[PDB]
Amino acid sequence: ASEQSARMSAMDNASTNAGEMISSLTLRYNRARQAKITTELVEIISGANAL
Amino acid sequence: HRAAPLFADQSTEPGLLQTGIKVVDLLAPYAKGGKIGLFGGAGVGKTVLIMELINNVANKHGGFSVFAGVGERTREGNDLYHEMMTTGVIKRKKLEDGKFDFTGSKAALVYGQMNEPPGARARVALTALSVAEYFRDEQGQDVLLFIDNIYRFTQAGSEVSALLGRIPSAVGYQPTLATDLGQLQERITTTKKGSITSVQAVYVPADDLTDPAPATTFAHLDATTVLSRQIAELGIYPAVDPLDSTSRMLAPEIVGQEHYDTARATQKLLQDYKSLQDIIAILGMDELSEEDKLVVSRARKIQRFLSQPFTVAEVFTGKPGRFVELPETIKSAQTILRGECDDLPEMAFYMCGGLEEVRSKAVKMAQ
Amino acid sequence: TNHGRITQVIGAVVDVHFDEQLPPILNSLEVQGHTNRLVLEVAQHLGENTVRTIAMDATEGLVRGQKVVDTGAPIQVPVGVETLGRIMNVIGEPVDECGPVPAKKTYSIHRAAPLFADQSTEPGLLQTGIKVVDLLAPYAKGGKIGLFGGAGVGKTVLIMELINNVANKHGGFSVFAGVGERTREGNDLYHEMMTTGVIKRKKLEDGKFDFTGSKAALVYGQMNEPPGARARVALTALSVAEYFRDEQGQDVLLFIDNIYRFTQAGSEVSALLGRIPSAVGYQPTLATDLGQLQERITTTKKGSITSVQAVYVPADDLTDPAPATTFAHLDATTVLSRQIAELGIYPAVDPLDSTSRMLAPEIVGQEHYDTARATQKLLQDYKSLQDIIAILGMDELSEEDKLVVSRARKIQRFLSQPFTVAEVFTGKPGRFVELPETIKSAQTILRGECDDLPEMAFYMCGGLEEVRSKAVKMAQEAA
Amino acid sequence: ITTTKKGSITSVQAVYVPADDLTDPAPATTFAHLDATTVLSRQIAELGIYPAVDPLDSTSRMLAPEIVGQEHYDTARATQKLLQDYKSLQDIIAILGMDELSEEDKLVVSRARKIQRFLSQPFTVAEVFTGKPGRFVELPETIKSAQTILRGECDDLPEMAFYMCGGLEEVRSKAVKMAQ
Amino acid sequence: KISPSEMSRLLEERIAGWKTQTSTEEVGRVVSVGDGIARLFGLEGVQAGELVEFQNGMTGMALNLETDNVGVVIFGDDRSVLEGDSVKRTGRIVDVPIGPGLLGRVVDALGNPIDGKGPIPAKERRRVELKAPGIIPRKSVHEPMMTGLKCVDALVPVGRGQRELIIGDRQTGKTAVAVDAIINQKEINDSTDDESKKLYCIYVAVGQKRSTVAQIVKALEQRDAMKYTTVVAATASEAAPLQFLAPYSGCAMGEWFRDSGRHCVIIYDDLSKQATAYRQMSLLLRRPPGREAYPGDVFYLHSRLLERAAKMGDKSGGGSLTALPVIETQAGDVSAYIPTNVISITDGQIFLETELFYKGIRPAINVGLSVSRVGSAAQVKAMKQVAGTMKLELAQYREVAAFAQFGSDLDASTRQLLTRGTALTELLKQRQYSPMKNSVQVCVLYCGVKGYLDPLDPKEISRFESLFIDYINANHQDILKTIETEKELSEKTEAKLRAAVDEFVAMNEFKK
Amino acid sequence: VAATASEAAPLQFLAPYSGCAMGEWFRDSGRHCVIIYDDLSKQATAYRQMSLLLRRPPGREAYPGDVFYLHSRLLERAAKMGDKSGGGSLTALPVIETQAGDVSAYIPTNVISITDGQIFLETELFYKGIRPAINVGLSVS
Amino acid sequence: VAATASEAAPLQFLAPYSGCAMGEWFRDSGRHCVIIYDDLSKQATAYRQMSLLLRRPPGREAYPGDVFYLHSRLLERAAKMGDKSGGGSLTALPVIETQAGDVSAYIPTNVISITDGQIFLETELFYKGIRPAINVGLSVS
Amino acid sequence: SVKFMDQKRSGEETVYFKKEDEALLRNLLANHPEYDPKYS
Ligand SMILES: Nc1ncnc2c1ncn2[C@@H]1O[C@H](COP(=O)(O)OP(=O)(O)OP(=O)(O)O)[C@@H](O)[C@H]1O
Ligand SMILES: Nc1ncnc2c1ncn2[C@@H]1O[C@H](COP(=O)(O)OP(=O)(O)O)[C@@H](O)[C@H]1O
């Protein structure tokens, strides 16, 4: 019984940590998305203005 | 294209806007000369929220309103026009010769259609804004201005900048983004003659609140009003999420330090009930203490008290409209949180607009 | 013949000035006064009797004012049965060191595709002797086939196995096109075809040669060659094949190695030709430059071309524009994976990314269709437990799920088989597995009449007999 | 900048890293020109460790056994191994926790946190906003301390006893005073 | 840096006092050529979007008018054009024929047929780029479009005048959905003499190859579907302007049905190759780009294209033009430029997935992301009565899906949801080129939602369904005719249905 | 000194320099003063605007390379004059808005490499109720 | 063959071709040879520099499109000749530095796609104690 | 986390099914003697 109680508690803590990590990775993902967009766009513009 | 109000012609006294909605006037109080975000699509009761705000502000504040459609769907425009003609927001009475008589209405409409090129979708908000500044300046009124989406303004600006050959900024947006948004949004404010409130609908691309469009809009927004289908599926209307909603006017200086206390108490109650729901989903509602069941009861009771009918939905439902002042809402929330009305039943709160009607409904449902 | 004068030189781009009679676009020009032969292909007209051209060979040694001669037609490659057994360049010149091409005809590499009114034929089934291919992605006899994959997955090895198991038995002809691949690989292919009779070179006492037989033609635009050559060598080989299709009415095979290099060799010159770049760095004229090729690659009412293209996928990213645009142009698809090749499961075919226009109940019967779909369902079910297994473990899974995992692992290991051209990596001999044998074995494994067997039996095997033999052997060494 | 037959230039260059991106072309190029390296980190500075040196991104050419001795070389390589083995558990610790780990891994985590906190030093110029006096530390003392921490002669001590102490005598005195 | 007027053949005239500018506004000389573009000097008077014609028979569109030259895009290859070739106007903006002469025909982006069957009669020729309808002429969607897919007709309904995007990954069954939508209309067009209850179809292909366009045409000639549809083909050999124009040609062909009191459904296959072509033409006309190198007129392009899809009022004739654009997403990311522009333009979404195409769930419709902004307004009540239930049941299944791998330990009220969800998921499965009617759909979904499949083995549901269909089509055509006529599932029809279901179950035997 | 959203971008680029010039009078006249630039990210946005409209080549987050110089020209004037220059002073309290608490961005780090301290503010503490929401582990001096 | 950083871009651009020229003497004269190009990415850096100062237009990562034809020319000179051409050989062992282990880049991808094998090297294995830190899974021949 | 989960899963499955294959190799020849070469 003690094992099962501790298992439930561990599942709670793991889900919480997973939510936190998902938040952080979502922030990083959006940052890298914007960075990729800006980089590709600057590449295109410099290749269009380098003629 | 009109210059914004100067520094001398601007009101330093902020003041709320008496809408007539309970959750709004309690937990996300609007302001005069303010700008309110409205995060929500369809299936939530947004058109009906719009018509109710229009009707109540026209009845009480005597003010007119404006609706701007920035690159909207044409069938959606047709639907909105016919819904207004049904709900009485517009009065289009035929005449004998064959002309029309647009008698006493409560809203003008300015539409820049999707089939229109960029430049119209960019100068439509300015058209509606001048139409509203006419009422503000000369007539001396407190008017409204609804905007179907503020992201399409930015789309059109970016397009126009690409056509004109301007080097795009970080994520393709134009380099005149904040400048143009300020040229727009600095005319929506209070003056010594009247005021223009505004309700802008916002679309966060890819759930990125850091995108420069919403990052520049939230600086101008004095409030926020989120909708959800997970509260409309409960039958609650308006489906305003009292937690996700925010405001800069909820502080205990504009509203006194009783509005603030009631609002924070209700938010605490609803967070506790959310956690209790997440628990009851697993452990069942038998493992709850008496104080926990009291919290659950009060939370469901206030979540169903905040719902109310609409004068415009009368024609769709038959149930008439109920105006609810803010002191009345505050007293009702005080009593519900004090635990006085815990002897009432659940469904008396639902679709009711005050404790008088709730107790009457309970008296009649006892039979 | 017209006459022109080079005006400036930039890499693989040459701007030329004529006094009169400008040539049309795509026409061929020969440089006069150079060490070796140097050919230019017109690409643009700039005005003032000026043109811009792309060189087939290196521009090193070129001078302004050097003279140029228009040929009055684009790069014409020789054609016939005289190109057979022989290696040829992009400009038709041979590089096998065996003599010149005594061809009685030439075709322009630039032609117009067969129209819509020239329809395809029935979806003929192609038997390769490979299990996962013959089962889940049947290859069409008259349609395009794609082998998508990165680096180090077995593309040219798979092509060599397909050549061994198809081209030798084929009564029609065959063409190979090396587009920016390795020269060691070209040498190896040439040696293996000379060995296995696909090429039949016979030297003569008078110093000549005889390529009689030799039902194959080869074309090479390899890495050492510049762009313009890497670009036009595919057109060259495709004209060589269009000859056999249209006139001789033959059935033809067409293998292409690293077609991606075509697109690369467009992007290498577009910005020199004054075009604005598109997305990540390819050119704007990608889909049209690829479609003019692919639409020329099609079956007609005079012949048929079954084509097999290997598609490099840089960084294993299938969202790249070149593969994205190429998936729409293929009848059959076969995607190779590293996560699978790491397990030693060769061929490393992903049966959840491989597709085929042919896999339908009306073409292949329901005994085949339902078997394939049941296999795919089993493998997707096994894939939808990987995280549960990685987190909790096998202890949590029911016996239904354990049975599913066992059967899926056995199928995974069973689809592997050894090829004849992989003896020099594995040492094991090669196998040819017919399709009814594959379907019988898969039906058996899915029905459950082999759960008693172990899993290491279903490895590098071409049937169930070998599986039972290996299980017997493993039990003997177990006791 | 190069030593020659006439004289010598020792050089100490501070290299900015914009947006905390070490893949920028400027630092990428600059990495090729250096004889010794020291990469500071914000993830390590947020823990209050100062100097916030990342000993894995940091490197040098004068670490080989033919320059520094074999005990120095082996201690350095063992410390790097320990810190990499601790880095490899960060994900599973963040998700699940230390309880999932075995006992070897828990010992590794303990010694890695201990040697992290032991690789921190109060400088003299920091006294104005830290208050605590500065600690010069010799090399044989550092090496003995690292050897003992790796062997296991300081597992009995706490983790906050290594924070800003220099050698081990200070760490043991601080653990004594913290026992009260 | 020199202008075409400054070349040293014209300046030999200007210096020499030659005033032979009598060369009209109709004729010009080619100045430059490349990549499908031409640049002329003259034609001061040519309209934007106008057709011009070269010496060697070919034609092109003038797009980039400039102060010193004119920019032209060619409908062919550049080997014909060179060195001051004369270009002459035609005077007519690009147009295409319209009428019943296109039904059963395949045509390019300019009406020129490619079937090899003969020319096309055309009493009416309509422009290709027109103004879209306004607000007042339109009407509210109050009528449905499709039968053939239970999942769509129940949970993502499509109305007449709607714009339902079909978005998904490569090789999911998008062309199959389109061809089933086309094939189903045979019974409804053959069971009627009036051309106001029928639904015609237009299939625009962009970026497709002929060896699959021909397979589509073959499948429709097998099933006699071409009599009420027409194909517009702008393949990869066809130039970028033709790939760019084919959707507008289709909209022009559909406006005839819309304005004349009829109903059509148009199907743009690979709109992303349209946008691609426009990009390829802007980067060669040296227009200024945006992100992913797409110009700023892409949203405006798709908007012009899609805002013609409409439902006109009873004063215009009552016609309609539904739209089912198709889009390939290369990773499932619908946050890209073209996906976000099209979901912003369209009236809905059907999201297909690849993980479900291999689990046997075909059509692989993900009903969580698939939506329909019209909704039950595009549904008969006979379908409402079952879909309002099935939506909630499948939502609960999606809420408790992960528990399927742990159901052995859970309890009832949570295993019943899994069972019903699995039964419905196996019921909505369907076969390629085998669409059903709405009455049959209602009957089957009543059998499903009313618990007559919980106690069954799921693998048997495809049999259950099949046999039940045959049974009812053999026995209770009166029930089917009543449901088709009244468009309602009354209590009497429900009792008849439960009776027939009980009879079927009694007559037949299933596994579990 | 007001340069609001409706005001032009050159005026937003200026207003900080005008305020610093107004404070230089006290600094040079022996007085003491303090300037509060309530938004520097908007100054940087306006400089990026002017550069992109002047066709200059963008960089990281489209900001040009003269942003560090732009900010440091302004912030290096805040000073404590000595005994022979009168003894005046001029502090400086520049203000910066972040996006999701990211301080590893370009502009925050550009200004942290110019300033002599940091006062950090949080939305967690501001929604909880701690006001002023001044964190103390990240704030330094 | 030392083409260092002070040495101009054209010398850095020419050094590996000079090495292949020195090795073709062995390859052709019946002898054997091995050539080690160290920092083969600086060659591409120098080519980018040259083309950008010659006003040639860039591609992706600011490189030109001729990088494939920059490395193919060079690496196709490595070869094993036949018994008629002497029997010589020229082996090649190019070297590449990746950033954050990103082999999805352009130059690493090109050179992996034009070589007969790979020898990956990792810092995790270099610090765990494995020296040489060769990953024998990704590494092939 | 990715290589972590993948390699842990692969090792666990390998061990489990190694055990199961050992057991099946034990109990094969009894229940299927027609393959047993002892009787051939
Ligand atoms: N209901 C179905 N039943 C059986 N097979 C199906 C079904 N739906 C699709 N398939 C198969 O899916 C494959 C692709 O069909 P389809 O071309 O319609 O999808 P797609 O995503 O449009 O393909 P592409 O991206 O190449 O254009 C076909 O091989 C088809 O046999
Ligand atoms: N059945 C197989 N047996 C042995 N080795 C194989 C097998 N399949 C692939 N290999 C791998 O194929 C690789 C060859 O790849 P190849 O087709 O020459 O180029 P590419 O990487 O572009 O596909 C070899 O390195 C070898 O490791």
PDB file of C-alpha atoms in Angstrom, chain B residues 42 71-79 81-82 92 111 113-118 121 151-152 155 158-159 162-166 168 171-172 203 205-206 229 233 282, chain E residues 131-141 161-163 288-291 295-300 303-304 307 335 337 340-341 343-348 371 373-374:
ATOM      1  CA  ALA B  42     -17.347  31.072 -33.010  1.00  0.00           C
ATOM      2  CA  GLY B  71     -10.631  41.425 -44.250  1.00  0.00           C
ATOM      3  CA  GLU B  72     -13.667  39.437 -43.138  1.00  0.00           C
ATOM      4  CA  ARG B  73     -15.595  36.661 -44.834  1.00  0.00           C
ATOM      5  CA  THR B  74     -18.457  37.924 -46.966  1.00  0.00           C
ATOM      6  CA  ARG B  75     -21.014  35.397 -45.752  1.00  0.00           C
ATOM      7  CA  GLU B  76     -19.994  36.339 -42.205  1.00  0.00           C
ATOM      8  CA  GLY B  77     -20.710  39.973 -43.043  1.00  0.00           C
ATOM      9  CA  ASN B  78     -24.094  39.022 -44.491  1.00  0.00           C
ATOM     10  CA  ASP B  79     -24.886  36.980 -41.376  1.00  0.00           C
ATOM     11  CA  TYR B  81     -26.016  42.333 -41.082  1.00  0.00           C
ATOM     12  CA  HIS B  82     -29.079  40.085 -40.975  1.00  0.00           C
ATOM     13  CA  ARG B  92     -34.224  49.396 -42.224  1.00  0.00           C
ATOM     14  CA  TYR B 111     -16.344  46.658 -44.276  1.00  0.00           C
ATOM     15  CA  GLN B 113     -13.813  42.761 -47.895  1.00  0.00           C
ATOM     16  CA  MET B 114     -11.358  39.930 -48.408  1.00  0.00           C
ATOM     17  CA  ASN B 115     -11.607  40.433 -52.172  1.00  0.00           C
ATOM     18  CA  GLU B 116     -10.306  43.986 -51.696  1.00  0.00           C
ATOM     19  CA  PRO B 117      -6.577  44.640 -52.192  1.00  0.00           C
ATOM     20  CA  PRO B 118      -4.127  45.587 -49.434  1.00  0.00           C
ATOM     21  CA  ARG B 121      -7.773  46.357 -45.230  1.00  0.00           C
ATOM     22  CA  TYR B 151      -3.994  40.935 -37.147  1.00  0.00           C
ATOM     23  CA  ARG B 152      -5.261  41.567 -40.679  1.00  0.00           C
ATOM     24  CA  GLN B 155      -1.004  41.566 -42.649  1.00  0.00           C
ATOM     25  CA  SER B 158       3.278  44.009 -44.321  1.00  0.00           C
ATOM     26  CA  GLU B 159       1.907  43.376 -47.812  1.00  0.00           C
ATOM     27  CA  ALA B 162       6.536  44.468 -49.553  1.00  0.00           C
ATOM     28  CA  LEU B 163       4.912  45.996 -52.627  1.00  0.00           C
ATOM     29  CA  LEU B 164       6.524  49.373 -51.952  1.00  0.00           C
ATOM     30  CA  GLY B 165       9.854  47.585 -51.534  1.00  0.00           C
ATOM     31  CA  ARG B 166      10.585  48.134 -47.847  1.00  0.00           C
ATOM     32  CA  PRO B 168      10.872  43.382 -44.005  1.00  0.00           C
ATOM     33  CA  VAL B 171       9.329  37.799 -39.033  1.00  0.00           C
ATOM     34  CA  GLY B 172       8.361  39.409 -42.336  1.00  0.00           C
ATOM     35  CA  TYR B 203      -5.485  36.256 -33.335  1.00  0.00           C
ATOM     36  CA  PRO B 205      -0.415  33.164 -34.788  1.00  0.00           C
ATOM     37  CA  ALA B 206       0.902  29.760 -33.702  1.00  0.00           C
ATOM     38  CA  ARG B 229     -16.317  26.425 -25.746  1.00  0.00           C
ATOM     39  CA  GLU B 233     -20.893  23.403 -23.555  1.00  0.00           C
ATOM     40  CA  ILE B 282      -9.642  10.698  -9.914  1.00  0.00           C
TER      41      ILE B 282
ATOM     42  CA  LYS E 131     -14.784  41.017 -59.069  1.00  0.00           C
ATOM     43  CA  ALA E 132     -16.263  38.619 -56.535  1.00  0.00           C
ATOM     44  CA  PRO E 133     -19.882  38.861 -55.374  1.00  0.00           C
ATOM     45  CA  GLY E 134     -20.811  41.315 -52.658  1.00  0.00           C
ATOM     46  CA  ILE E 135     -22.648  40.845 -49.387  1.00  0.00           C
ATOM     47  CA  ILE E 136     -26.248  41.507 -50.418  1.00  0.00           C
ATOM     48  CA  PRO E 137     -26.335  39.093 -53.408  1.00  0.00           C
ATOM     49  CA  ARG E 138     -25.135  36.243 -51.187  1.00  0.00           C
ATOM     50  CA  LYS E 139     -27.282  33.949 -49.051  1.00  0.00           C
ATOM     51  CA  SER E 140     -26.897  31.995 -45.830  1.00  0.00           C
ATOM     52  CA  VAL E 141     -25.954  28.331 -46.104  1.00  0.00           C
ATOM     53  CA  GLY E 161     -21.648  27.915 -50.790  1.00  0.00           C
ATOM     54  CA  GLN E 162     -19.029  26.765 -48.258  1.00  0.00           C
ATOM     55  CA  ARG E 163     -15.215  26.564 -48.440  1.00  0.00           C
ATOM     56  CA  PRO E 288       9.960  42.336 -54.372  1.00  0.00           C
ATOM     57  CA  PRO E 289       9.618  39.204 -52.230  1.00  0.00           C
ATOM     58  CA  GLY E 290       8.409  38.443 -48.715  1.00  0.00           C
ATOM     59  CA  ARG E 291       8.908  35.514 -46.376  1.00  0.00           C
ATOM     60  CA  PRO E 295       5.212  38.056 -52.722  1.00  0.00           C
ATOM     61  CA  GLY E 296       2.645  40.054 -50.766  1.00  0.00           C
ATOM     62  CA  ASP E 297      -0.173  39.326 -53.238  1.00  0.00           C
ATOM     63  CA  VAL E 298      -0.606  35.680 -52.212  1.00  0.00           C
ATOM     64  CA  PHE E 299      -3.314  36.311 -49.634  1.00  0.00           C
ATOM     65  CA  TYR E 300      -4.962  38.639 -52.157  1.00  0.00           C
ATOM     66  CA  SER E 303      -8.838  35.608 -51.601  1.00  0.00           C
ATOM     67  CA  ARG E 304      -9.803  36.657 -55.128  1.00  0.00           C
ATOM     68  CA  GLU E 307     -14.413  34.681 -52.409  1.00  0.00           C
ATOM     69  CA  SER E 335       1.531  27.409 -39.153  1.00  0.00           C
ATOM     70  CA  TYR E 337       2.429  31.036 -44.662  1.00  0.00           C
ATOM     71  CA  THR E 340      -2.293  30.057 -42.394  1.00  0.00           C
ATOM     72  CA  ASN E 341      -3.472  32.170 -45.341  1.00  0.00           C
ATOM     73  CA  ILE E 343      -7.317  28.535 -43.206  1.00  0.00           C
ATOM     74  CA  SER E 344      -7.853  32.278 -42.706  1.00  0.00           C
ATOM     75  CA  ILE E 345      -9.604  32.447 -46.089  1.00  0.00           C
ATOM     76  CA  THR E 346     -11.644  29.222 -45.985  1.00  0.00           C
ATOM     77  CA  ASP E 347     -14.908  28.274 -44.275  1.00  0.00           C
ATOM     78  CA  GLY E 348     -13.657  25.129 -42.559  1.00  0.00           C
ATOM     79  CA  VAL E 371     -13.914  21.608 -38.041  1.00  0.00           C
ATOM     80  CA  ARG E 373     -17.684  26.823 -39.353  1.00  0.00           C
ATOM     81  CA  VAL E 374     -21.100  26.196 -40.937  1.00  0.00           C
TER      82      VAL E 374
END
